[PDB]
Design a protein around this ligand. Structure first.
Ligand SMILES: Cc1cc2nc3c(=O)[nH]c(=O)nc-3n(C[C@H](O)[C@H](O)[C@H](O)COP(=O)(O)O)c2cc1C
Ligand SMILES: CCOC(=O)c1[nH]c(C)c(Cc2ccc(C(F)(F)F)cc2)c1C
Ligand SMILES: O=C(O)c1cc(=O)[nH]c(=O)[nH]1
Length: 377
């Protein structure tokens, strides 16, 4: 669309505000401002039909296009509608925990524009499962009455409170509160900002976690119209994995994912292993964005092979352009999540990246996105 003729996601004024934000305004404040505008439904909408040749699925989850918003973006589910309506097919709200908590002291989010990278040490700041459940329930009620929202997907990422000893207690609480409203549940065993959380990727611990989560979801129908979500079915179960793993760890994790019949794997969370960004040198936390891209694409290729292509992959890490997305898809991903792209490219990100991917699928000779999945191998 013309950035000057019309209020649409490409509207020029948002690019002027984005440039000002990136130069002058603290990152978490910029993010809060975006969420404030979305909560009040000020943000433009993408009303276009997405190309039928770029749809994708994971089992019965039918994504209308291949781009969603990653976890940590709308932690509290406060502007689900406005984010989706920028042109995304899905959003992963959370990560939530049973009780609300503040997270780590601010400033805890920093950007490096030159390298299109972000570092954060948020520490699972969220309003808590009960309030976020109330938010998701209100979304689901608006969704029943909205032409624009009817087929969009909402997953919920779940984690543990800061002082919880046994993570499964917290995952079960969340499932029993919010699981009926989710299209999928993402198990967060990969935040670098909760000390010890990533230890739960060890095969034995991870297996028990996955089996516990599936058992709790399976019990929702026994204990209890039921599925007040998009699929009208019980939520699928995904695990989100850390990129900072050796090959032995990756291989034992793959074996567990196969053994437990997990529905998908989100590859990947942030990394702790990037140290050539000078403005991050004194900073804690996990790195996102363009310096994560190659690490996470390689990890996709590895896990796709190690699971013999039997476990669908949601790609996360350093996706900015249509080419970046195609690279993820050809590596093995069925669908992409964005986060840093929205920080550095703003309101127009979904409209721009869908168009760029549609042009590449054509230029490369693919009939549709599904035939690209895994084609590198
Ligand atoms: C400020 C911030 C907070 C995040 N919070 C979470 C979170 O709560 N849960 C989660 O699974 N990932 C979280 N992430 C990770 C992103 O979901 C994503 O996996 C990562 O940023 C890599 O994608 P990107 O390179 O497109 O940004 C967070 C990322 C950022 C930058
Ligand atoms: C990593 C910390 O998050 C950020 O640094 C951040 N997060 C988002 C979603 C953005 C993009 C953005 C575009 C327009 C506006 C305005 F409201 F001004 F229009 C506000 C924000 C930025 C810069
Ligand atoms: O809460 C955060 O600090 C956070 C969670 C997560 O999973 N990943 C991340 O980079 N930050």
């Amino acid at each position: 669309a013309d950035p000057f003729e019309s209020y649409n996601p490409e509207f020029f004024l948002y690019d002027i505000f984005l440039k000002f934000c990136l130069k002058y305004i603290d990152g978490e404040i910029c993010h809060d401002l975006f969420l404030l505008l979305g909560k009040y439904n000020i943000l433009p909408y993408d009303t276009s039909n997405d190309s039928i040749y770029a749809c994708t699925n994971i089992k019965h989850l039918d994504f209308i296009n291949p781009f969603g918003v990653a976890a940590g973006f709308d932690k509290n589910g406060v502007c689900i509608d406005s984010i989706l309506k920028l042109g995304f097919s899905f959003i992963e709200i959370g990560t939530i925990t049973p009780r609300g908590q503040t997270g780590n002291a601010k400033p805890r989010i920093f950007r490096d524009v030159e390298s299109r990278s972000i570092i954060n040490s948020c520490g699972f700041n969220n309003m808590g499962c009960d309030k976020v459940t109330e938010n998701l329930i209100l979304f689901r009620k608006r969704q029943e009455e909205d032409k624009l929202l009817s087929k969009h997907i909402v997953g919920v990422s779940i984690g543990k409170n800061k002082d919880t000893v046994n993570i499964v207690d917290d995952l079960k609480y969340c499932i029993n509160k919010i699981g009926r409203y989710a299209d999928y549940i993402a198990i967060n065993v990969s935040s670098p900002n909760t000390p010890g959380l990533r230890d739960n990727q060890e095969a034995g611990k991870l297996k028990n976690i996955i089996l516990s989560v599936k058992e709790e979801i399976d019990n929702l129908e026994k204990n209890n119209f039921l599925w007040f979500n998009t699929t009208k079915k019980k939520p699928l179960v995904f695990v989100k994995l850390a990129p900072d793993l050796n090959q032995e760890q990756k291989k034992e994790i793959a074996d567990v994912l196969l053994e437990t019949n997990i529905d998908g794997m989100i590859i990947s969370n942030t990394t702790t292993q990037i140290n050539d960004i000078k403005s991050f040198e004194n900073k804690k936390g996990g790195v996102s964005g363009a310096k994560l891209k190659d690490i996470s694409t390689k990890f996709i290729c590895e896990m796709y092979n190690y699971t013999n292509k039997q476990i669908p992959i949601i790609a996360s890490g350093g996706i900015f352009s249509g080419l970046d997305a195609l690279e993820k898809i050809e590596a093995g991903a069925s669908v992409c999540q964005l986060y840093s792209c929205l920080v550095f490219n703003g309101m127009k990100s979904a409209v721009q990246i869908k168009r760029e991917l549609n042009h590449l699928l054509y230029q490369r000779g693919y009939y549709n996105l599904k035939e690209a999945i895994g084609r590198k191998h």
